[PDB]
Design a protein around this nucleic acid. Structure first.
Ligand SMILES: COc1ccc2nccc(CC[C@H]3OC[C@H](NC(=O)c4ccc5c(c4)NC(=O)CO5)CO3)c2c1
Ligand SMILES: [Mn+2]
Ligand SMILES: [Mn+2]
Lengths: 673, 672
DNA sequence: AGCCGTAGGGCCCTACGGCT
DNA sequence: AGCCGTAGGGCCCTACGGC
């Protein structure tokens, strides 16, 4: 990995740590290879503050850093033996780079403290607006960042130790609550110089943490999506990949999304897209995949060069009226594109499909739900702001998993909908049945959500082999496209099969809990929310969307009647119209002449100058009158909706109801007492 | 291993499907009936056992997995009794690479498991085409077509004459290239049971002709392989021109993968990267931003990091592509159109050169100076009987991006005469003082295609293993600011020149370029000499300029015809408007306009599409200005089409301009 | 040898939080 | 104790021909 310098005189020698060979290459090409060494790492380095020492000392990248510095670790640490008097951290100028920087400072503080004391550690300052240093040309990387003349390094000073120790403990240690508190306390949500090592850690760390929270791992309460899923669906949309049209190569989709909207690795995008295609993961799948999109047995999808994809019908409902000023667009990562900040989301997607995400200081875990039940819930809520969770549960019985199965008891469900937290006990659907000669078997035909069917079956085998469960004489996955899931467990003759089943439910994922933890972005801040808040924020979104959409169609039909007004004047005075144009030299004079003569606006004048001659035929004259008369009718319909809060809300209901009628379906998961 | 066995054991009723990898595997595993159907994914191309020794075969993972899985052992240890399946089913992707992996698999079974074949246990599944690999198929469909024993069509492989079979495996898959080449030349055609010899011959031949005509060899006209052509056409169709800014590498590769080139990402991205390296291409076709590699054989950044567009001179490859200069063809799936060849307004085969390993043959064509090339083609255009020797008054010999030296003219001369020759390339190295009466060797240019770091390591090896006297140190002082610089310290009092000569004998510091000018001519491979290359090249240009002139003619005559309808209309504007105003439909207006004013359908249409702003005052006059300049152009064009000396001179003229704008100095020095 | 350059194909480290 | 899902990062086997 190391690409060393010529000079062995450590006095004048620098080593640069970079994230991988992609940056490595640019760095190598632009360095001064007499004084300047380069060590590429390989992504996130190990967190030494949370890891056992066995594996701190085995980890490659840790090891190689040790070798390169040649000073040994901890007690047996000779400053005098530093092969370099400058260790320069130069990760990418993105948030994951800030995080890899915190990880490294932690390693150095806890294993090479003197190195920091001695003033040998530094932080390079590459320009922003660059995914990694691999996107820079070597000359740029040199001028800006590496050239001893016209560059700016921060030298890491350690002031108070005690404070440093607490900081590393809080930020990087395994007590989440300490970290969570710091985030809350310091996050500001939207509506050779010395650098203190504590200052750097808290600023770098918070930068990462906030970024993961608002812009990675948590879904938005309004549309139920994380950034990656939003930019995927929105890309499908901008490229017209509707279900009527045909499937397009995943690589096209991914390439496009990566380029315009999502400056991150290919596999994060493709894997997100894949899940959205899996009817064992999504209760209402958002992508329609062609090819191998993986199995319940933990199989990956085929590589993105093989598969293809489009929207499902129901994703249309997520995107409807996105170009009717329903929702605010923002700048993409680099200035050159516009992306939606949220989707219209005309059905309640946060709950329908659920969410899961590991952030920093917190996580989220929201189960999926029956859409017929959810919309009935939003209906009841719309007729009654003061409805209770108990009343809402009259409609929303509890979660509805794609994989079906059983939930045991209404009581975890109730806590989760009331507090935002609760454990939910899920079981497989298993029956006991004769197989012949007075012997029996267990048949599992549905397994709990998020359980790998293979791993589950291996577990049972590994219980039968470690002689750790009695009575089982065979185990077979008879699952098949033709017959559905079907896992068979033969039972020894005369053994009690019900007992064996209970044993499996105790000792295998045949029974599994689901720990609800309903954190989402509300005003782009993380909040633990109950069932009713989820539906309130959802309905508040829908109200705004149907209002803005109605306001937009008004401005637009008004703009258009205005033009049809110019054109009807034209048709009534066509001879004089022709005359005015013919007697004009420029287009500028005609425009002025038509405004004055016939009291037309600039826009009308221009639309008349744009009329083609074929529009003076019989049918074309009629269409202009017809389009105009239909449009006045529509304009006054729109005005009705905007002048009356109750007609608007009634529209919201009628629309929800239509979606419930077209996409609603049976409950799959049975909830038992 | 990723073996997914079935649940039954008795092999009489159990089958195993071999597929290319896990993408195919998953569709196969979700599709299959797992009571009787095992699946074993491989990993792409398997080893050719006909060309490998036994130590290597038995180290190979995929080979091992197959042996284990089948349970018969191999060779004389073979045993039909211990078969775990009575049907072994080869199910590779429905493409040419899948024919090839079929031939490799059958080569393994015939040489190590022949009784398996003698006994009827081997089979070939028949998936549908249209799908890159099985990973693009849904499991329901792969079940119906291919795997379900009530529907599928299986071929059962049969051995007849074992002597013929031996000859075939030997010829097709053995180490002797020439019999294979001969079999290709003899069988190629350019523009229930299955005999194993027929399968081998037909599957291999497919593969072979696919690599030859459509992978590894350049076209003589444009100097390009399918992958480079599709990339450049891609850049163009998305206007990624040099005036515009850079697009993202992943977008470009994604575009091209979908539209034109159904193959792995890395083949595309790597082809693009090389086109951007100024140490690889004498005249780079791609302009890249980010890490695109080094002479030390670092690869580019991954494609999420880099951006790219055309270079100035690529516009010249593409100039006039829209003027019917070249025949477009269907892409691989029917939903696109691609160029079969580029206009190529400079001679790109010899300019940037080409190297490719095919089947039965290879190509290796060095790069050249463009100022020289062009003077060459001009000279040829003044004299169809120009000799190689006269041609070499312009074209001194290869000119490499990396500069350096060529020793003597005799390899050059042989190469240009016959299309084969060996050319000795040598570093640019000087000897210089370093202080205290010591000296060093400074190397500042290295041969084409010689990895600099790997070369420095071969020098270290010699010093370490004491096969060279007198070297005390070795350093790469290469930098952006300094250019290539490799220093070799010599021991006080040792003769530096001697040392340097040893380095030339013993290191890539001197390297042969083995010229072997194979290219496609009417899409068939041909060994061509210097002159035959320039001639095909000149022929393409004349065709281009002629087809270009024919196109502008059709187009200017079409436009004149429109303008003759517009003249009539502006001159009769009222009767025109009444004619229309009186007409119920757009149809009736066309008919009336046409009867009353002697107009064609297309003249009537142009009038009906006329906007009212065209009736302003100075428009009857513009139409007339335009129309008179059109008639002038029309005849300027007819001049050209009727006199071949005028067309040829036109060709000469455009080339001279390209020479003036893009021609640069020779970099490689030719020492005699 | 083993390397040139288009082709087939796939695997494994790391962070992060909460549940087992 | 190790999985789940967005994220950071990269490597190594194969065919082909010519020297
Ligand atoms: C399969 O299993 C193995 C296992 C062993 C391996 N050892 C080392 C490295 C790897 C893979 C690392 C490599 O890095 C670059 C990756 N792709 C991109 O950067 C990229 C970005 C955007 C894109 C595309 C690609 N593809 C498009 O068509 C457009 O959108 C491709 O994968 C290995 C792979
Ligand atoms: Mn990075
Ligand atoms: Mn394949």
């Amino acid at each position: 990995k190391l690409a060393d310098c010529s000079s062995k005189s450590p006095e004048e020698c620098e080593i640069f740590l970079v994230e991988g060979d992609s940056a490595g290459g640019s760095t190598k090409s632009g360095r001064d290879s007499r004084t300047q060494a380069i060590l590429p790492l390989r992504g996130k380095i190990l967190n030494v503050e949370k890891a056992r020492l066995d594996r701190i000392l085995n980890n490659n990248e840790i090891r190689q850093m040790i070798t390169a510095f040649g000073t040994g670790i901890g007690g047996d640490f000779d400053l005098a033996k530093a092969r370099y008097h400058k260790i320069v951290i130069m990760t990418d100028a993105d948030v994951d780079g800030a995080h890899i920087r915190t990880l490294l400072l932690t390693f150095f503080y806890r294993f090479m403290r003197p190195l920091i004391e001695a003033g040998y550690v530094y932080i390079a300052q590459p320009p922003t607006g660059y995914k990694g240093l691999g996107e820079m040309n070597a000359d740029q990387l040199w001028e800006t960042t590496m050239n001893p003349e016209h560059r700016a390094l921060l030298q890491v000073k350690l002031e108070d130790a005690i404070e440093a120790d607490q900081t590393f403990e809080m930020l990087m240690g395994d007590v989440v609550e300490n970290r969570r508190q710091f985030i809350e306390d310091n996050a500001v949500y939207a509506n050779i110089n010395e650098r203190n090592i504590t200052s750097e850690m808290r600023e770098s760390f918070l930068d990462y943490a906030m970024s993961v929270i608002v812009a990675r791992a948590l879904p938005d309460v309004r549309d139920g999506l994380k950034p990656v899923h939003r930019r995927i669906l929105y890309g499908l949309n901008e490229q017209g990949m509707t279900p009527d049209k045909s499937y397009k190569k995943s690589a096209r989709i991914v390439g496009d999304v990566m380029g315009k909207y999502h400056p991150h690795g290919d596999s994060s995008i493709y894997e997100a897209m894949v899940r959205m295609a899996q009817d064992f993961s999504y209760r209402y799948p958002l992508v329609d995949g062609q090819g191998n999109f993986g199995s319940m047995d933990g199989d990956g999808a085929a590589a993105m060069r093989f598969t293809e994809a489009r929207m499902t019908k129901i994703t249309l409902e997520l995107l409807r009226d996105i170009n009717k000023d329903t929702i605010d667009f923002i700048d993409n990562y680099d200035g050159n594109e516009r992306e939606p900040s949220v989707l219209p989301a005309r059905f309640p997607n946060l709950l329908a499909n659920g969410a899961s995400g590991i952030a920093v200081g917190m996580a989220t875990n929201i189960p999926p739900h029956n859409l017929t039940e959810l919309i009935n819930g939003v209906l009841s809520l719309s007729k009654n702001p003061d409805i209770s969770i108990a009343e809402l549960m009259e409609d929303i019985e509890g979660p509805d998993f794609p994989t079906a199965g059983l939930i045991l008891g209404k009581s975890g469900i109730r806590r989760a909908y009331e507090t935002g937290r609760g454990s939910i006990q899920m079981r497989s659907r298993a029956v006991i049945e004769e197989r012949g000669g007075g012997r029996q078997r267990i048949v599992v035909t549905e397994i709990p959500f998020q359980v790998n069917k293979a791993r589950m079956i291996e577990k049972i085998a590994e219980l039968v082999r470690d002689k750790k469960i009695d009575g089982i004489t065979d185990l077979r996955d008879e699952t098949s496209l033709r017959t559905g899931v079907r896992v068979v467990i033969d039972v020894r003759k005369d053994a009690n099969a019900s007992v064996i089943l209970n044993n499996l439910y105790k000792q295998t994922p045949l029974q599994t809990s689901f720990g609800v933890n309903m954190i989402a972005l509300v005003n782009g801040r993380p909040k633990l929310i109950n069932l009713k808040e989820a539906l309130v924020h959802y309905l508040e979104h829908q109200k705004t969307v149907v209002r803005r959409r109605t306001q937009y169609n008004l401005r637009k039909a008004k703009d258009r009647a205005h033009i049809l007004e110019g054109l009807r004047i034209a048709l009534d005075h066509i001879d004089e119209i022709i005359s005015t144009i013919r007697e004009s030299d420029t287009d500028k004079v005609a425009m002025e002449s038509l405004q004055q003569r016939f009291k037309l606006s600039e826009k009308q004048a221009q639309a008349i100058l744009d009329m083609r001659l074929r529009r003076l035929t019989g049918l074309e004259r009629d269409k202009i009158e017809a389009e105009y008369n239909e449009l006045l009718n529509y304009i006054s319909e729109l005005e009705t909706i905007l002048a009356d809060e109750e007609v608007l809300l009634q529209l919201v209901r009628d629309e929800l109801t239509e979606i419930r009628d077209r996409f609603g379906d049976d409950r799959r998961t049975e909830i038992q007492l």
